[PDB]
């Protein structure tokens, strides 16, 4: 029977008394204004201790409570559950888990669960020891909640293995399981006739299938029944053939965090009062002598909570919220008036939460406790490098070592060989100056067919002009030659996928070593945000990602068709507004760039807002890049502010005074020929390796094809909102990803569109 | 709000942001005022073969946050993968 404890309201007095009854120095448990007074998770037992002990009494769980020395206790928050606030109202319910009659006595496992607002918030797992000999084969039972294993059905010889297993009952017996991820809500009850052989096996629980839209459905039932069992074959099956959802990764070398001197107080009276553990053994020497022990034993859970303070102090960076778990295994016993030298080690890392392993030493150099501790650090955020930063043999050091890199690079390169008949891994490794893609053979025809579908859908006066990329390639073309001046890796079509893959392979190596919290934010440097997005969210598959970035790279190579060499009369420049003048802010830079671009009649705009009043990357016409370079050379030398003179001298006369300087600069900037170099200014520094004018006005035509591609290559089945929401920060709209009328209306303001305006008007239809 | 509708709306919202950020200016000034300030993120990693966003997030903090980072008892670690991997993997030299 499920036991229920009295609904115990949390107060600020009881928590304030407990921060001295353990001696906690964490300031997140002190009573101060504005910020909440969070409960230390070690206080959760004070709520549930009453109910947990109520499960150990029953007349079919019998043993000497004096010879009951607590074995192991924990605290685990369920996922998402916030830890307990100051004023919270927390109810307790517990059930006794397993009655295991060990040869040395009887370990009884108790599972308590605390509930706030109606919902669970933390579960307390404990084991206790009635020592002696327990012919308790009738009163025993095992009732454990087996881990949700998965099993991937990639192949038909292995679905035949699963179907041979009678326990896999299907609702639709014809349901094609192939190319799916089943999960198993297994919970196993077992009676024992002996201390090893089981009396009867009970394996039941529904079986689900993860659907592409990530909404599972119960397609089967596990139902395994037998007599004289020696082990659950179901769980034994899923142990080898299926896989555990969570696999903790460890370090090469565990981090020796510290070994801290915690002193046990002479008295165990101040904590026995606040804990409800009246047990005299801790205080009463006469009781402590009857137990055969060498005096008034320190409260175990007091040694637990004292080490928890140290785990929160030096492994959870002194924060209440971020610590997730805390277990303590009772090894030995320690008295009052000891200097416990607790050996804390960071051994593991799992999915954001740091695995912290400790054993407790005294002055006597012996171990009295062990235990674990989960601590999330949600304080990670990712920034991804853009173009130009590529070099020959990049991400090959990571390639030869990691499997997470290897499998990424290999999958991409196999995709590229089989799709476009070339090796991104060949290019990166040895940077061939030229690459000849041969369309000879049935491979070569199916490659050429892929090349034929690469098309600019560029709007020209409210009508699409679908102009093929590499026009030459047609149904009679035999072999095309990709050409570079120095090394194709340098050409953007290959820079973009190579960079995006190396940054995906590095981030997938961190997934393999699990150093990445699941609630970190991210944003990327123009192209970088494609890597970040594929990385943190899994928005694009590896084959999707490389294709879309390749298509971008083709769109951006022939966005502006060039001369024979391939010298686009376009580019970029990274401007320090402080260089020209400190008073010359971001409002004087956007005013002077818009006034030079309207007069000179050429294109120049601000495309990256990198650093606040230190870096703004401005792209457009290369003569409109060297004439604004000379405009911030001439304003710097003259020390003449435009924001002073436009308000504090004359209204719009400075705009008529800015023509004549722009007319000076643009009549010396129109002299230099077309193959002109962008020569560094006193205010500006020209960008190297970027001949394309990315994010300028020059590629306003080629937005509609890039949309058409992102409509054919982002499928909503892959896209989830949970994994994005709060984290995803676009480059244009520097806001958290929100699925609201606030964000639809703020994106329609920046750059209006027919499908965002259709959703804002029809938002009330899609509300319900 | 329905899951199949919330999937359609998030799919169109992202698709249009990426289709336009393609050819749109990158407001990285306010991007560094989404996480550095508003979400008190502690550890920033730069994924790439050279640090560019590294000197960017560090000089944003020195300009606007040197009095906001020292007044709330927090250590901002601006890291690049290719330069500072040791700190990532937790693989120091003893």
The whole-angstrom separation of Cα A399 and Cα A506 is 9
Q: CATH code at B38? A: 3.90.25.70
Strand pairing partners for A371?
A: A358
> Residues B48, B81: contact at Cβ < 8 Å?
yes
Which whole-number Å values give the CA distances from A463 to A456, A558, A698, B19, in the listed order? Answer: 13, 19, 17, 19
* Nearest to A205, CA basis, from A154, A158, A143, A153: A143
Q: Determine the straight-line distance between the first and last CA of chain A, rounded to whole angstroms.
A: 43
Q: Write the secondary structure of A573-584 as one string of H (helix), E (strand) and C (coil).
A: EEECHHHHCCCC
The verdict on a CB contact (< 8 Å) between B25 and A532 is no
Burial of A200 (0-12, 13-18, 19+ CB in 10 A): middle
B28: contact with A, CB 8 A cutoff: yes
Structure tokens that stand for A367 in this block: 């171990």
The whole-angstrom separation of Cα A324 and Cα A317 is 13
* Nearest to A268, CA basis, from A242, A314, A300: A300
- CA-based nearest distance B71→chain A, Å: 16
> Residues A593, A618: contact at Cβ < 8 Å?
yes
Among B23, B25, B91, beta carbon nearest to A703 = B23
- CA-based nearest distance B51→chain A, Å: 7
* Nearest to A399, CA basis, from A285, A509, A478, A298: A509
Among B17, B29, B88, beta carbon nearest to A747 = B17
Inter-chain CB pairs, A–B, below 8 Å: 247
Residue of A nearest to B40 (CA): A379
* Nearest to A95, CA basis, from A76, A81, A108: A108
B34: contact with A, CB 8 A cutoff: yes
Strand pairing partners for A458?
A: A465
CATH of domain A1-132+248-377: 3.10.129.10
Known catalytic residues of A?
Answer: 526
Q: Best residue in A524, A553, A610, A728 to probe B by mutation, most B CBs within 10 Å?
A: A610
> Residues A378, A370: contact at Cβ < 8 Å?
no
Whether the CA torsion A757, A758, A761, A763 is positive or negative: it is: negative
- CA-based nearest distance A324→chain B, Å: 18
Residue of B nearest to A764 (CA): B1
B57: contact with A, CB 8 A cutoff: yes
> Residues A619, A696: contact at Cβ < 8 Å?
yes
> Residues B89, A512: contact at Cβ < 8 Å?
no
Q: Write the secondary structure of A468-516 as one string of H (helix), E (strand) and C (coil).
A: ECCCCCCCCCCEEEEECCCCHHHCHHHHHHHHHHHHHHHHHHHHHCCCC
Residue of B nearest to A744 (CA): B13
The verdict on a CB contact (< 8 Å) between A703 and B47 is no
Q: What is the dihedral of CA A388, A495, A708, A736, to 10 degrees?
A: -50
CATH of A433-486, one of 3.40.50.720, 3.40.640.10, 3.40.80.10, 6.10.60.10: 6.10.60.10
The whole-angstrom separation of Cα A749 and Cα A757 is 10
- Entry resolution (Å): 3.6
Element (H, E) at A756: helix A754-761
> Residues A578, A632: contact at Cβ < 8 Å?
no
The whole-angstrom separation of Cα A177 and Cα A156 is 9
DSSP E strands: which ranges in A613-736?
615-621, 684-686
> Residues A428, A462: contact at Cβ < 8 Å?
no
Q: Is A504 left (phi over 0), alpha (psi -120 to 50) or beta?
A: alpha
The whole-angstrom separation of Cα A48 and Cα A532 is 44
Number of other CB atoms surrounding residue A189 within 10 Å? 14
DSSP string, A439-451: --HHHHHHHHHHH
The string over A736-749, giving b where at least 16 C-beta atoms fall within 10 Å of a residue's C-beta and e elsewhere, is bbbbeeebbeebee
User: Count H helices, E strands: chain A?
Assistant: 21, 29
Number of other CB atoms surrounding residue A70 within 10 Å? 17
Residue of A nearest to B35 (CA): A521
Residues 6+ positions from A43 with CB-CB distance below 8 Å = A10, A14, A15, A18, A84
Q: Best residue in A249, A390, A556, A611 to probe B by mutation, most B CBs within 10 Å?
A: A611
The verdict on a CB contact (< 8 Å) between B6 and A721 is yes
Residue for token pair 């508003």:
B38
The whole-angstrom separation of Cα A543 and Cα A247 is 26
Alpha helix ranges (H) inside A675-753: 703-713, 741-750
**Strand-pair category, A570-575 with A615-621:** antiparallel
DSSP E strands: which ranges in A40-134?
72-77, 89-100, 105-116, 119-131
- Rg of chain B, C-alpha, whole Å: 17
> Residues A139, A61: contact at Cβ < 8 Å?
yes
CATH 3.40.50.10420 fits A133-247, yes or no: no
Number of other CB atoms surrounding residue A135 within 10 Å? 7
Local structure of A652: helix, strand or coil: coil
Residues 6+ positions from A577 with CB-CB distance below 8 Å = A584, A585, A586, A588, A589, A613, A614, A616, A683
CATH of domain A562-689: 3.30.70.3330
* A456 contact residues in B (CB cutoff 8 A): none
The verdict on a CB contact (< 8 Å) between B12 and A615 is no
* Nearest to A768, CA basis, from B13, B6, B11, B10: B6
* B62 contact residues in A (CB cutoff 8 A): none
The whole-angstrom separation of Cα A10 and Cα A90 is 7
The whole-angstrom separation of Cα A394 and Cα A397 is 8
Element (H, E) at A635: helix A623-638
* A212 contact residues in B (CB cutoff 8 A): none
- CA-based nearest distance A459→chain B, Å: 14
The verdict on a CB contact (< 8 Å) between A703 and B63 is no
The whole-angstrom separation of Cα A675 and Cα A536 is 42
Cα A73–Cα A74–Cα A78 angle in degrees, nearest 5 = 150
Residues 6+ positions from B32 with CB-CB distance below 8 Å = A612, B56, B57, B60
The number of domains in chain B is 1
The verdict on a CB contact (< 8 Å) between A506 and B81 is yes
Structure tokens that stand for A727 in this block: 């984290």
The verdict on a CB contact (< 8 Å) between B39 and A381 is yes
Q: Determine the straight-line distance between the first and last CA of chain B, rounded to whole angstroms.
A: 53
Residue for token pair 């899994």:
A538
- CA-based nearest distance A104→chain B, Å: 42
The phi and psi torsions of A451 (rounded to 5 degrees) equal -60, -40
* Nearest to A687, CA basis, from A570, A580, A555, A561: A570
Local structure of A539: helix, strand or coil: coil
The whole-angstrom separation of Cα A737 and Cα B21 is 14
Q: What is the DSSP letter of A323?
A: B
Structure tokens that stand for A182 in this block: 């089943």
The whole-angstrom separation of Cα A371 and Cα A329 is 5
- Rg of chain A, C-alpha, whole Å: 34
Domain range list for chain A: 1-132+248-377, 133-247, 378-432+488-561+690-730, 433-486, 562-689, 731-768
The whole-angstrom separation of Cα A703 and Cα B19 is 6
Among B23, B31, B54, beta carbon nearest to A734 = B31
The verdict on a CB contact (< 8 Å) between A379 and B54 is no
The whole-angstrom separation of Cα A560 and Cα A619 is 13
Q: Is A169 left (phi over 0), alpha (psi -120 to 50) or beta?
A: beta
The verdict on a CB contact (< 8 Å) between B9 and A766 is yes
Looking at CATH, the fold of the domain delimited by A731-768 is given as Helix Hairpins (6.10.140)
- CA-based nearest distance B69→chain A, Å: 14
* Nearest to A633, CA basis, from A575, A696, A693, A569: A575
- Give the range of the structural domain holding residue B23, as residue numbers without chain letter: 1-93
* A253 contact residues in B (CB cutoff 8 A): 91, 94
The verdict on a CB contact (< 8 Å) between B45 and A382 is yes
B66: contact with A, CB 8 A cutoff: no
């Amino acid at each position: 029977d499920v036991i229920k404890g009295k609904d115990f309201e949390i107060t600020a007095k009881e928590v304030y008394d407990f921060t001295h009854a353990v001696g906690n120095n964490c300031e997140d448990f002190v009573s101060r204004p504005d910020r909440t007074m969070l409960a230390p998770m070690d206080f959760a037992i004070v709520v549930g201790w009453r109910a947990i002990i109520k499960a150990i009494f029953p007349n079919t769980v019998d043993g000497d409570l004096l010879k009951l020395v607590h074995l192991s206790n924990g605290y685990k928050m369920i996922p998402g559950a916030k830890p307990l606030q100051v004023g919270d109202v927390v109810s307790t319910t517990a059930v006794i888990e397993s009655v295991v009659n060990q040869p040395t006595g009887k370990i009884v496992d108790v599972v308590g669960t605390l509930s706030r607002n109606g919902k669970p918030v933390m579960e307390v797992t404990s084991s206790f020891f009635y020592r002696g000999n327990y012919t308790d084969f009738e009163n025993t039972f095992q009732k454990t909640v087996e881990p949700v294993y998965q099993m991937h059905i990639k192949t038909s010889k292995d679905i035949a293995v699963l179907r041979s297993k009678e326990w896999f009952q299907l609702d639709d017996e014809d349901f094609d399981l192939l190319n799916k991820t089943l999960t198993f809500e297994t919970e196993t009850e077992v009676t024992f006739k002996n201390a090893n052989i089981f009396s009867s096996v009970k394996c039941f629980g529904p079986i689900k299938v993860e659907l592409p839209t990530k909404e599972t459905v119960e397609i089967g039932i596990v139902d395994y029944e037998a007599g004289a069992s020696h082990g659950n074959p179901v769980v034994d099956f899923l142990k080898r053939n299926g896989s555990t959802l969570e696999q903790k990764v460890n370090l090469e070398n565990p981090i020796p965090i510290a070994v801290l001197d915690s002193y046990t107080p002479s008295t165990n009276e101040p904590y026995a009062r606040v804990s409800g553990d009246l047990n005299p053994i801790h205080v009463s020497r006469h009781f402590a002598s009857y137990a055969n022990l060498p005096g008034t034993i320190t409260h175990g859970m007091f040694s637990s909570a004292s080490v928890r303070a140290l785990i929160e102090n030096w492994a959870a960076d002194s924060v209440s919220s971020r610590v997730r778990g805390y277990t303590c295994q009772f090894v030995d016993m320690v008295l009052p008036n000891t200097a416990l030298k607790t050996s804390i080690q960071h051994v593991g890392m799992i999915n954001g939460r740091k695995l912290i392993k400790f054993e407790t030493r005294n002055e006597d150099d012996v171990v009295v406790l062990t235990g674990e501790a989960e601590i999330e650090q949600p304080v990670t955020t990712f920034v991804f490098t853009g173009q130009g930063s590529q070099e020959q043999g990049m991400g090959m050091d990571l390639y030869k070592t990691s499997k997470a890199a290897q499998d990424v690079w290999n999958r991409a390169d196999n995709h590229f060989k089989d799709t476009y008949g070339f090796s991104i891994l060949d290019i990166v490794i040895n940077n061939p100056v030229n690459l000849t893609i041969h369309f000879g053979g049935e491979k070569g025809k199916r490659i050429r067919e892929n090349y034929s579908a690469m098309i600019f859908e560029t709007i020209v006066d409210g009508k699409l002009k679908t102009e093929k990329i590499f026009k030459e390639i047609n149904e009679h073309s035999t072999s095309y030659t990709f050409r570079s001046e120095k090394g194709l890796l340098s050409a953007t079509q290959f820079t973009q996928p190579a960079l995006t893959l190396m940054e995906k392979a590095a981030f997938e190596d961190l997934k393999s070593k699990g150093l990445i919290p699941a609630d970190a934010t991210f944003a990327g440097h123009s192209l970088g945000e494609y890597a970040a997005l594929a990385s943190l969210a899994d928005v694009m598959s590896i084959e999707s990602l490389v294709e879309v970035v390749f298509y971008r790279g083709m769109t951006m190579q022939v966005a502006v068709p060039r001369d024979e060499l391939g010298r686009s009369n376009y580019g970029m420049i990274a401007i320090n507004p402080g260089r020209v003048a400190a008073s010359f802010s971001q409002e004087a830079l956007q005013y002077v760039v818009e006034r030079v671009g309207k007069r000179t009649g050429w294109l120049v705009e601000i495309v990256n807002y990198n650093v606040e009043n230190q870096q703004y990357v401005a792209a457009g016409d290369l003569r409109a890049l060297d004439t604004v370079t000379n405009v911030l050379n001439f304003i710097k030398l003259q020390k003449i502010d435009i924001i002073e003179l436009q308000k504090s001298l004359s209204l719009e006369e400075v705009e008529g005074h800015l023509f004549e300087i722009i007319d000076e600069a643009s009549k010396k900037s129109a002299v230099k020929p077309r193959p002109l170099k962008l020569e560094r200014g006193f205010a500006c520094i020209p960008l190297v390796g970027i001949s394309v004018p990315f994010h300028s006005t020059y590629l306003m035509n080629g937005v509609k094809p890039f949309k058409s591609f992102l409509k054919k290559n982002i499928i909503k089945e892959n896209v989830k909102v949970a994994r994005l929401a709060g984290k995803y920060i676009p480059n244009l709209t520097a806001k958290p990803f929100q699925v609201t009328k606030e964000y639809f209306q703020d994106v329609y303001d920046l750059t209006g569109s027919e499908p965002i305006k259709e959703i804002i008007d029809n938002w009330e239809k899609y509300e319900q | 709000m329905k899951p199949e509708v919330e999937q359609e709306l998030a799919h169109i919202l992202l698709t249009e942001l990426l289709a336009y950020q393609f050819a749109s200016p990158v407001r990285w000034i306010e991007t560094q005022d989404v996480f550095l300030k508003d979400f008190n993120t502690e550890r920033v990693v730069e994924i790439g073969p050279s640090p560019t966003l590294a000197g960017m997030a560090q000089r944003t903090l020195k300009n606007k946050y040197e009095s906001y980072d020292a007044a709330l008892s927090l250590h901002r670690e601006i890291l690049c993968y290719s330069k500072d991997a040791k700190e990532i993997y937790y693989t120091p030299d003893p």
